[PDB]
Amino acid sequence: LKPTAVLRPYQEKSLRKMFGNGRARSGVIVLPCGAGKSLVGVTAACTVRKRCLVLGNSAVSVEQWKAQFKMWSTIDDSQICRFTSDAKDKPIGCSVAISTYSMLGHTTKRSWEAERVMEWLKTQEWGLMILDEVHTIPAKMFRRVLTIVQAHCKL
DNA sequence: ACGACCAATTGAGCGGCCTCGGCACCGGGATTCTCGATCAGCGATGCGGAAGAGAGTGAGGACGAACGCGCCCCCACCCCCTTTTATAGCCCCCCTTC
C-alpha cells in the first residue's frame, strides 16, 4: 500500500478484527460505498501479500477495482489483469486477477480462449479471494464460484 | 234457588300410530373450487456467437524531374571606315562612230 493511502479508524478496526493474528480470518466486512470499502480490500491484499483474486458484480466494478489498485498500491498496471470476455490482459501473464461472477460462474459453454485462463485459475491457489457486493453471492450460480476457485481465505 | 252431580249422548279435540319426505338441520359423503409450487414477468447483467469500418494494391492519373536541343543574348576583338601618293591592268558607264 503506497503511503498515499489514508486509513480511517473504522477501516483500521475492521482490518484489525479481520487480522486478529498473523493468520487472516475469513468473513464479511460491511462498509458503505462512500466508506472506501475498495481501499479495505486493497489493503487486505497488500496485507496478505499473496496471489489474490478480486471478483466484481459488473465490468464497471472491475474497472473501478483496477483503478483503485493502481491508485492505492505499488503494483504496476502489467501486474494486474482483468479476466473478462469484453477485454483481455493475458491474465496468465500476471499474478493479480480481476473478473466477475458471470464469467467464472458461467453455466454454459466457455470460449476456448477464456477456458485457457479459467483452467489456469482453477489450478492455481488463491491466497485471498475478495468478493464485492456479496449480497449477490448466495445466488445459485454465483455461489458455484466458491467451489470452482481454490482460495485459502475469502473476504 | 241454584248449583253440582248423573245419566245418556256425542263428536271435536286429542294422543297416538302411521309414514314419510320437504325441508333444515346435522354429519358425514367425492368433491368445483381453495390454496401452495412452478413458471412468467420487468429491466438489468454478462457471456457467447453474429455484422461493418479500416486496411491493401491492383493499377493508371498529374506532373516533378532530368536530360538535349533549341533560340536567343551579351560579350571580346577585330577589321574596316578615312586620308595621301606612286603604279598598272582590269572593269563599267558612258560616249561615240558606224
UniProtKB/Swiss-Prot annotation:
Location of the Helicase ATP-binding domain: 18-155
Range of the intact protein held here: 310 to 464 of 782
Disease cited in the entry: Xeroderma pigmentosum complementation group B: An autosomal recessive pigmentary skin disorder characterized by solar hypersensitivity of the skin, high predisposition for developing cancers on areas exposed to sunlight and, in some cases, neurological abnormalities. The skin develops marked freckling and other pigmentation abnormalities. Some XP-B patients present features of Cockayne syndrome, including cachectic dwarfism, pigmentary retinopathy, ataxia, decreased nerve conduction velocities. Trichothiodystrophy 2, photosensitive: A form of trichothiodystrophy, an autosomal recessive disease characterized by sulfur-deficient brittle hair and multisystem variable abnormalities. The spectrum of clinical features varies from mild disease with only hair involvement to severe disease with cutaneous, neurologic and profound developmental defects. Ichthyosis, intellectual and developmental disabilities, decreased fertility, abnormal characteristics at birth, ocular abnormalities, short stature, and infections are common manifestations.
Species of provenance: Homo sapiens
Annotated localization: Nucleus
Taxonomy, superkingdom: Eukaryota
Miscellaneous information on this protein: The TFIIH core complex from patient XP11BE (a patient with XP/CS who has a C-terminal splice-site frameshift from residue 741 in this protein) reconstitutes in vitro transcription about 30% less well than wild-type but does not restore NER in vitro or in vivo. The XP11BE TFIIH complex has all the subunits in the same stoichiometry as wild-type. Purified mutant protein has very weak 3'-5' helicase and ATPase activities. In another paper the mutant protein has wild-type 3'-5' helicase activity. The mutation is recessive to wild-type. Conventional DNA helicases unwind DNA by binding to a ssDNA overhang of dsDNA and then translocating on this strand with cycles of ATP binding and hydrolysis to 'unzip' the dsDNA. XPB/ERCC3 is believed to be an unconventional DNA helicase principally because it translocates in a 3'-5' direction along dsDNA instead of ssDNA, thus it is referred to as a DNA translocase.
Signal peptide segment: none
Function per UniProt: ATP-dependent 3'-5' DNA helicase/translocase. Binds dsDNA rather than ssDNA, unzipping it in a translocase rather than classical helicase activity. Component of the general transcription and DNA repair factor IIH (TFIIH) core complex. When complexed to CDK-activating kinase (CAK), involved in RNA transcription by RNA polymerase II. The ATPase activity of XPB/ERCC3, but not its helicase activity, is required for DNA opening; it may wrap around the damaged DNA wedging it open, causing localized melting that allows XPD/ERCC2 helicase to anchor.
Family: Belongs to the helicase family. RAD25/XPB subfamily.
Subunit annotation: Component of the 7-subunit TFIIH core complex composed of XPB/ERCC3, XPD/ERCC2, GTF2H1, GTF2H2, GTF2H3, GTF2H4 and GTF2H5, which is active in NER. The core complex associates with the 3-subunit CDK-activating kinase (CAK) module composed of CCNH/cyclin H, CDK7 and MNAT1 to form the 10-subunit holoenzyme (holo-TFIIH) active in transcription. Interacts with PUF60. Interacts with ATF7IP. Interacts with KAT2A; leading to KAT2A recruitment to promoters and acetylation of histones. (Microbial infection) Interacts with Epstein-Barr virus EBNA2.
Binding site residues for ATP: 31-38
The protein's name: General transcription and DNA repair factor IIH helicase/translocase subunit XPB
Motif interval(s): DEVH box: 132-135
Modification note: Dephosphorylation reactivates the 5'-excision step. Phosphorylation has no effect on transcription or the 3'-5' helicase activity.
